């Protein structure tokens, strides 16, 4: 049940709600008020979903799907089998996620560390809330949200994007993608660097953080440093998701035409609009 060094850490304290009531573990898992909150919301949502599996007559992971109320129902309630289930499940999902985050904070308090982790998680949670909650509300209907099933939520990505042409042209989706890729490049480099220093050529002695700075310098003539690259990873990642959410919250709401056509603002500028030649003259 405990890691060799764990026991000195398992002290009382740090809870946000409940005093000592749920201050304990189950195997490896810390509980807490919010370990309980996330269980209730999580198990409810699973039930509510397996219920939805019955009312559409499949018991199959690749087919089970739960749709928002149709566009017609507005931003108001809906019969369970025709979009109500989804609404309560979403309420559950939010409950589970936010609870998971506040539980994470409680673990932070006990362990004496910074709140950086749940802070980062809340970006991902805010992306999700952008798809199922903030965009729908600004757009007038639950039906605009994505549906919970494995292949059917992809269908929604395709339909939502092709509504605007090739979605590539959303310029906040461009920034977004740039951060995802950049992040991946940074995750490979960090990983590979730390390992090439800890696991040197056969028989040599393990290298040092100065070797790590040296390797980079030699290669591209800069090194961000070991604090730097962990600041970087975290920034690239949070920025990917920030831009992800931004590209979607502006889509169908301030811009709803074909994304490629937004790029005409640049071309139709007074000082070069009408010069001949190139592609647009």
């Amino acid at each position: 049940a405990l890691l060799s060094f764990e026991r000195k850490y398992r002290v009382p304290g740090g809870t946000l709600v409940g005093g000592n009531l749920f201050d304990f573990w189950v195997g490896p898992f810390y509980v807490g008020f919010f370990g309980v909150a996330t269980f209730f919301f999580a198990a409810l949502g699973i039930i509510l979903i397996a219920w939805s599996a019955v009312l559409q007559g499949t018991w199959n992971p690749q087919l089970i799907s739960v749709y928002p109320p149709a566009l017609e129902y507005g931003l108001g309630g809906a019969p369970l089998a025709k979009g109500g289930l989804w609404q309560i499940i979403t309420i559950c999902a939010t409950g589970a996620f936010v609870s998971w985050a506040l539980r994470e904070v409680e673990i932070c308090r006990k362990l004496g560390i910074g709140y950086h982790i749940p802070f980062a998680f809340a970006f991902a949670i805010l992306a999700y809330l952008t798809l199922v909650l903030f965009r729908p509300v600004m757009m007038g209907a639950w039906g605009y949200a994505f549906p919970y099933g494995i292949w059917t939520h992809l269908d929604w990505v395709s339909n939502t994007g092709y509504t605007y042409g090739n979605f590539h042209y959303n310029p906040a989706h461009m920034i977004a993608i740039s951060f995802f890729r950049t992040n991946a490049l940074a995750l490979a480099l960090h990983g590979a660097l730390v390992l090439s220093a800890a696991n040197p050529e056969k028989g040599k002695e393990m290298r040092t953080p100065d070797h790590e700075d040296t390797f980079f310098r030699d290669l591209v003539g800069y090194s961000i440093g070991t604090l730097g690259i962990h600041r970087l990873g975290l920034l690239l990642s949070l920025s990917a998701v920030f831009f992800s959410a931004l590209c979607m919250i502006i889509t169908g709401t301030i811009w709803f035409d074909q994304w490629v056509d937004w790029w005409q603002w640049w071309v139709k500028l007074p000082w070069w609009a009408n010069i001949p030649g190139g592609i647009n003259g």
Partner: protein, 240 residues
């Protein structure tokens, strides 16, 4: 059909990769223990990996992992309950005893070395050519604890040579001795450094170092330990 092969092949490669990866991550803290220190019955589905041996540089030796795991220190804690999985109450003063969020590991009692074999961390005074290049220079500022009292004054910055970054502030107490405070744990303001983790009276219990121009891995852990522990353990000494 080639693609169906490619993809079946790949789910196998990946299950193997996950095995490799999870075993590699058992070179520390395993085998699992009961709350009493003995081997636990349930070790999970993954076996300990074949040990490996890192050659430490500058003749500091080697490290082999996994290997015989032990705390190498009394742990001042006691059970609060009669079965598995409850919190363990501190037997004395948890700050002083080094438990909870005030824990330290018993790391080596040498300081870390740069690639040249010199100390990595050094007070600025002794660091050839190093000076504050930006931001408010703290050296000179009174230091305020979470109780809003002046604990001491800053008297130098301990810096990291190979990576040119501040690591501690060295601070001077009422009595004329000094302490390290981790950079990451103070706020430098226009007219003071502020320390949220510690009430002013807790400053004297900051673990001291032995040489006054170098600090050891073991001493960093105690200092960082102690100071982090203040978040939880000072907190009845501040309506902050």
């Amino acid at each position: 059909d080639l693609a169906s092969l490619a993809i079946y092949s790949f789910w196998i490669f990946l299950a193997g990769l996950i095995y490799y990866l999870q075993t590699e991550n058992m070179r520390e803290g395993y085998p699992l223990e009961n709350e009493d220190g003995t081997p636990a019955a349930n070790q999970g589905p993954f076996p300990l990996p074949k040990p490996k041996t890192f050659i430490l540089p500058h003749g500091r030796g080697t490290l082999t992992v996994p290997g015989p795991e032990s705390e190498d220190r009394p742990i001042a804690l006691a059970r609060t309950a009669v079965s598995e999985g409850f919190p363990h109450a501190p037997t004395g003063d948890p700050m002083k005893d080094g438990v909870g969020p005030a824990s330290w590991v018993a790391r080596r009692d040498l300081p870390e070395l740069d690639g040249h074999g010199h100390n990595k961390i050094k007070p600025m005074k002794a660091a050839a050519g190093f000076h504050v290049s930006a931001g408010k220079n703290p050296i000179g500022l009174p230091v305020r604890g979470c109780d809003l009292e002046i604990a001491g004054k800053v008297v130098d910055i301990w810096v990291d040579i190979p990576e040119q970054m501040a690591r501690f502030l060295e601070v001077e107490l009422k009595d004329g001795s000094t302490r390290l405070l981790p950079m990451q744990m103070v706020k430098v303001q226009s007219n003071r450094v502020h320390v949220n983790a510690l009430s002013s009276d807790l400053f004297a219990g900051i673990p001291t170092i032995k040489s006054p121009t170098e600090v050891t891995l073991l001493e960093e852990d105690k200092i960082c330990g102690y100071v982090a522990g203040g978040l939880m353990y000072a907190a009845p000494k501040r309506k902050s």
